[PDB]
Specification:
- This is part of a larger assembly, with 2 copies of chain A (431 residues) and 2 copies of chain B (403 residues).
- Chain A is built from 15 helices and 11 strands.
- In chain A, 58% of the residues are buried.
- With 403 residues, chain B is an alpha/beta fold.
- Chain B contains 14 helices and 11 strands.
- In chain B, β2 and β3 form a beta hairpin.
- The longest helix of chain B is centred in the middle third of the chain and has 20 residues.
- The radius of gyration of chain B is 21 Å and the shape is globular.
- Classes of the chains: A alpha/beta (431), B alpha/beta (403).
- Chains in contact: A-B, A-D, B-C, C-D.
- At the A-D interface, α10 of A face loops of D.
- Chains A, D: GO terms for molecular function: double-stranded RNA binding; GTP binding; GTPase activity; structural constituent of cytoskeleton; structural molecule activity; ubiquitin protein ligase binding.
- Chains A, D: Keywords: Acetylation, Cytoplasm, Cytoskeleton, GTP-binding, Hydrolase, Isopeptide bond, Methylation, Microtubule, Nitration, Nucleotide-binding, Phosphoprotein, Ubl conjugation.
- Chains A, D: It is found in: Cytoplasm, Cytoskeleton.
- Chains A, D: It catalyses: GTP + H2O = GDP + phosphate + H(+).
């Protein structure tokens, strides 16, 4: 009834979707061929027999990642027509993914999404998985979000985006794509749960004892975050939280909608054996500045909204005591215009351990979505890099000779400056 | 007779455990069958249940919800078959404005169900509402139902068990929903405040246990109505003897805390019901009214002595401008009488005003900066302006001034 | 009726074994149940116990302590379930100033417990306090409680069993705590000195046995009150007949020392109670008052003859400026009467003054060099100055002069 | 409830902690893997299953000793994250352990100690095991104690330190480190139970018949002392004594807080068979000048406070008689301003014999913590050696070129002179 459609764009989105759907199949007992040896309805559809087709599309402008999906262990899980692929990728170019290469694919993606929506009864919204500093993860994501806003102008559109890291980076033109995507989607998005590869690397090293993690472990952690977010739709709990609940409780103003994701019980097997992870402990770990999965120090800013999504053996009184302890803390400061900055969700299903993963089996877990003004510093860094590269006008010819104008660069930079001003304004205390 | 309207996840659960307690008390089988030992029962059942040709009993309950998951889980419980599938309603597909908009949208079927249930009772007395005021579902849907009900049925009582948001623990948009629900409660509600903070405080010193306690409170409140006696044989009798409320129950003891079988008089109980600690909710503020319902063996001489001693000890304070009550009931003959004598207290006290002063302070702490109003503007009700909000705030201020 | 306030490890234990002795005497089962043979008992139980609806009896006791370990061990004993968990109090987390500061900090809950216990008794007569004056916990906490109690309840007696530090055996900061506790005792205490030195001396010639003897003393002191007779049917009767005290008990015999079943008259017992050896505590100093409570068969003719002979033999000395007492009781019908007749003595004698002269000498032996005052300056009470100490010392000096 | 955290710094501290935790595991029946085939709560924490994790940290700037711990028989007892280690040690240099190498580790140690404190409910205090004449045992110990005073400014901080011996010595720069540590920690400590390797060597030779003892036997004896000290927290007895009791009864003035540890029934198996060790005998052995575990003759000074901690089959009357006998002695003299100089603690648990140790199984034992003015002579010797080496200015370049100044040397020497003056003043009789 509360069906939701997940859209995975680009290599980052497709691989995170691989991890997410592996986790969903494990959680709901669905075999990797769609058969089982309700709860599995907001994300899967039943076709006559036991076949459960996931309610998602995998769209990329490059055949490689989608073909890996098509021939992997989950080759028979996804509908072959919902694994949409192009011929030539966007080559880390926003213009290619938005204007030149993305226009030859957007119609097919919209047709498939329309088929999925028609197959649904009540559509809660969309989950868009993508990366900020990619070609199709930026241009095609922005194009798709604007087309969805044109079509489904009322359904919520939550996006899980890999924010560029402060120091580590795999591409040279990431600031351009990030600024342009922020412009276009900020026009047409509800809330964007943000994450950094560098922060997850640090989390893995410090907590999971892994010194050489790959993208696979990062995707597993992100999939755990997404599972914690969607558990209320997929399972039954004391306090249910829907997508509209996220949108309402985490977005104070239409432009300030970039919360940061966190996951407390990130722990290895032996350490989990030696610990007694409780509600208070996991909450304190969530509010620890070193456990943030976006490399921004929360002490540099003020929280405006927090969404604590507990799951498993969790008692509401313990949650209330832990939240009261957090509020009594002095290092954790909130904005003065949000006397109540905690949306609490509790689910009865403990997190499922993926066979072959690094996370240990725990009795309870919490995912914390925090909207804070500490993201303003990350925005400032991103626009500073954009300003340097645009002042030298580097790489601009690649974007211009592909259906874009330098005026769009200037407009996007001005919009980002306005966003920084808005963050500064909401940061200050009322007088 | 009576009807129960429970909304939101909070209300849905509240109802689940309330009916669990009721069926436990009246010896009603999970499937609606009646146990052999209870065949000749004397307890009155019409008040909360109506029997069926199949000899099973059906609650006078209606399930409402914006989401399916909670009720779907309920129908997977051993108690699933008991409820009436016809009455249960689920939206096919967290904001107050959205809730009220849906309420405007789904008027017809809800009132169809309510009318069907109403016409099956000869002497319906009032309404019972269970909901939470913070979440989008409970707040808005209860607002809409209260408005259209007070409009539809101008000769029936409306009683609510409203759950208030925790404050020591930081719904991010709770101030708006709470303020609007309070507006509607003052403007339409006939008459039981509830808060998670103090409730869990007393629980300490899962939602399953919290709401078990809440259902205990509700059942103990309705006991005498369920079990006819001499006095207080009607809900209106209850309301007249008091008229916002707060509650407390003495024997709130775990199943493991029966080891201390303390010789429990009536005096000690009625005394315990007075302390702020036992008041389950969190300017020389004073009382307006106090009612103590006592279960088990009771000697009115003991009651008179306790009243005399408490009056002399002046442990309480009363209004200077106006001139309590101790009613007695009988325990169900089935549940073990682990307590020699037990006591429940419902009172009206001026201190409750503080609650609103907090929420007002919360709301004023947001309206000055226009926080999280984007979603509200989406709905028709707040599409043009927010005069609704201003009127609600001024109404609450007027109520605080009146207190 | 009566209440018991026991503080510090010393007081906590004292209470444990005192209640052990009481339940042994009155035939109270370890769990609070009553034995079948004692169903028709005539002994009065309200004095130290109050029964419960579950038929079990609960002591009128409150446990206080700065540390958990002792009481935690108590609750692991076979007698654990007997006590009232509500009354017991433990600090969540060795100095007098710190103790008094905490007492100021935790006023509310302690007096809540005390009031709850008090309101359950119709004819409360006084208070009983068991504590040690040297350690930080007992001294300071007893000081604070005595002050606030004499302030709160100006019409109740306050009796204490104060344990004094050993002196022949070298608390390093004992002089300060002892002196301050004595100040408070003179300034607020209605009326039983105790010292480890002479107590262990008589024991010879573990804490378990020492405090078993102490509990024996307490129970024998309260016997007649527990067992109503003709005369001395109230604690106030006791106090009036005497008014600092010291005690002695004749049949202080091991469980192995019953082999010598010595023909024990009343005369020989009452005589034995006079010797300094039996006085459990360690200028022609003389007596002020003597009371002898005798258990077992007793002929008043024998009592008169013993009194006459002792008076003629002038084994005692009395004040020249003022003009004893021999009361009789009945043994509990349960404990074996291994002794044909037994005797307990409580007296007021001027020699006790020496105690303080020692402690004063101890205190003066430190105040001249400012030893171990660093911790005291930490607390608020001694944050500015130590005028408290000077006033206490002068008060004790005044008491010694009065003696 | 009365949880206490033990901190072991340096090689001496870590090895003494090895002995101490072996003793604790034997006493509480805990297997060396943390499982048992309450009393075990002030020092251990339970994690769900029978796993008991000790409430301690093992911090060193050298990987060797900690790695020996990590691979020994107790490899699975300690939490892997609480065995903190560096890369390069302090090289017997106070400046390295306090300023240069210790600053790169203090944050991690404080984070772990904060985790342990949060895991506790009521924290009694800290037990710091270290050596006076070591690099990390001096500099890092002082740094950690000052940071703890900043953070936990109210919890008691008792330290078990290996005071440098009068004659035997393993390092050349011991006076420098000892004086600087005494300065810094004397600013920020409650009481320091002192011990000497030379005195324990003499005790072993005279009593235990061992002619070639190692550090292992010394550590076993010190662990017995620590067990006797903490028995009241770990077990039940007639007279309980807490850490605050030690602090109050043993420290007359804030600077004079250096008691000496003693243990009476140090005896071999055959000699224990031939003796009838009673309360009076063990008390007299405790007050014998040859049984002191700090090589200072008590007859050269005056006792100001004694803490007799009996354990096992001990009767209070016997203890009182023995203490009265001690007071009637004329060789044992007390200061005139302490007419009552005995804090007595009695525990019901007899000392546990370690399999493979040299101490025989006894029915009762006593540990005597004595604060006396005989330590003033040891301080005088230490500052005399410091004065010689500093007058020649030897080794000073090592300290100066590592974040320290010669002004700190002069200030530490002046502080030690003030401490000697304070001991002299408290020694004299009142007139």
């Amino acid at each position: 009834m509360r069906e939701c459609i997940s859209i995975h764009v680009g290599q980052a989105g497709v691989q995170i979707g691989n991890a997410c759907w592996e986790l969903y199949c494990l959680e709901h007992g669905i075999q990797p061929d769609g058969q089982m040896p309700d709860s599995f309805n907001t994300f899967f559809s039943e076709t006559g027999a036991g076949k459960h087709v996931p309610r998602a599309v995998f769209v990329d402008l490059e055949p490689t990642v989608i073909d890996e999906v098509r021939t992997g262990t989950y080759r028979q899980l996804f509908h072959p027509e919902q694994l949409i692929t192009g011929k030539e990728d966007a080559a880390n170019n926003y213009a290619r993914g938005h204007y030149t290469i993305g226009k030859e694919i957007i119609d097919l993606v919209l047709d498939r999404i329309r088929k999925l929506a028609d197959q649904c009864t009540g559509l809660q919204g969309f989950l868009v998985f993508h990366s900020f500093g990619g070609g199709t993860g930026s241009g095609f994501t922005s194009l798709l979000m604007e087309r969805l806003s044109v079509d489904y102008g009322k359904k919520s559109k939550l996006e899980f985006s890999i924010y560029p890291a402060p120091q580590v980076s795999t591409a040279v033109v990431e600031p351009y794509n990030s600024i342009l995507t922020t412009h276009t989607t900020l026009e047409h998005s509800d809330c964007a749960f943000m994450v950094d590869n560098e922060a997850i690397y640090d989390i893995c090293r410090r907590n999971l004892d892994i010194e050489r993690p790959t993208y696979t472990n990062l995707n597993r952690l992100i999939s755990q975050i997404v599972s914690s977010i969607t558990a209320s739709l997929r399972f039954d709990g004391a306090l249910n939280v829907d997508l509209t609940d996220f949108q309402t409780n985490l977005v104070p103003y239409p432009r300030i909608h970039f919360p940061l994701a966190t996951y407390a019980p990130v722990i290895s097997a032996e350490k989990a054996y030696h610990e007694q992870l409780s509600v208070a402990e996991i909450t304190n770990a969530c509010f620890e500045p070193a456990n943030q999965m976006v490399k921004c120090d929360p002490r540099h800013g003020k929280y405006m909204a927090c969404c604590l999504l507990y799951r498993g053996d969790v008692v509401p009184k313990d949650v209330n005591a832990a939240i009261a302890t957090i509020k009594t803390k002095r290092s954790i400061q909130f904005v003065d215009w949000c006397p109540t900055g905690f949306k609490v969700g509790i689910n009865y299903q403990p997190p499922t351990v993926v066979p072959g993963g690094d996370l240990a089996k725990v009795q309870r877990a919490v995912c914390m979505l925090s909207n804070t003004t500490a993201i303003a510093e990350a925005w400032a860094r991103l626009d500073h890099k954009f300003d340097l590269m645009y002042a030298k006008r580097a790489f601009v010819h690649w974007y211009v000779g592909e259906g874009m104008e330098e005026g769009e660069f200037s407009e996007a930079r001005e919009d980002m400056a306005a966003l920084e001003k808005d963050y500064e304004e909401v940061g200050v205390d009322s007088v | 007779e009576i009807i129960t309207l429970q909304l939101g996840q909070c209300g849905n659960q509240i109802g689940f455990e309330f009916w669990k307690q009721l069926c436990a008390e009246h010896g009603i089988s999970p499937e609606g069958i009646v146990e052999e030992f209870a065949t000749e029962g004397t307890d009155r059942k019409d008040v909360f249940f109506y029997q069926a040709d199949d000899e099973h009993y059906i609650p006078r309950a209606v399930l409402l919800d914006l989401e399916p998951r909670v009720i779907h889980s309920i129908l997977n419980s051993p108690y699933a078959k008991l409820y009436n599938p016809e009455n249960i309603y689920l939206s096919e597909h967290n904001n107050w404005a959205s809730g009220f908009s849906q309420g405007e949208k789904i008027h017809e079927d809800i009132f169809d169900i309510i009318d069907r249930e109403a016409d099956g009772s000869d002497s319906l007395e009032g309404f019972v509402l269970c909901h939470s005021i913070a979440g989008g579902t409970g707040s808005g849907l209860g607002s809409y139902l209260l408005e259209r009900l007070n409009d539809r049925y101008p000769k029936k009582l409306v009683q609510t068990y409203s759950v208030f948001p925790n404050q020591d623990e930081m719904v991010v948009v709770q101030p708006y929903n709470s303020l609007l629900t309070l507006k509607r409660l003052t403007q339409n509600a006939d008459c039981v405040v509830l808060d998670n903070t103090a409730l869990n405080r007393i629980a300490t010193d899962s939602f399953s246990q919290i709401n078990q306690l809440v259902s205990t409170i509700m059942s103990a409140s309705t006991t005498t109505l369920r079990y006819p006696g001499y006095m207080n044989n009607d809900l209106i009798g209850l309301i007249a003897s008091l008229i916002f409320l707060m509650t407390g129950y003495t024997p709130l003891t775990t199943d493991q805390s029966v080891a201390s079988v303390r010789k429990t008089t009536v005096l000690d109980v009625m005394r315990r019901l007075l302390q702020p600690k036992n008041v389950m909710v969190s300017t020389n503020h004073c009382y307006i009214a106090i009612l103590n319902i006592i279960q088990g063996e009771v000697d009115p001489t003991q009651v008179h002595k306790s009243l005399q001693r408490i009056r002399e000890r002046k442990l309480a304070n009363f209004i200077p401008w106006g001139p309590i009550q101790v009613a007695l009931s009988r325990k169900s003959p089935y549940l073990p009488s682990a307590h020699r004598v037990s006591g429940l207290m419902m009172a009206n006290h001026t201190s409750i005003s503080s609650l609103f002063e907090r929420t007002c302070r919360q709301y004023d702490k947001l309206r000055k900066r226009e926080a999280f109003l984007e979603q509200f503007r989406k709905e028709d009700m707040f599409k043009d302006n927010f005069d609704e909000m201003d009127t609600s705030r001024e109404i609450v201020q007027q109520l605080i001034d009146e207190y």
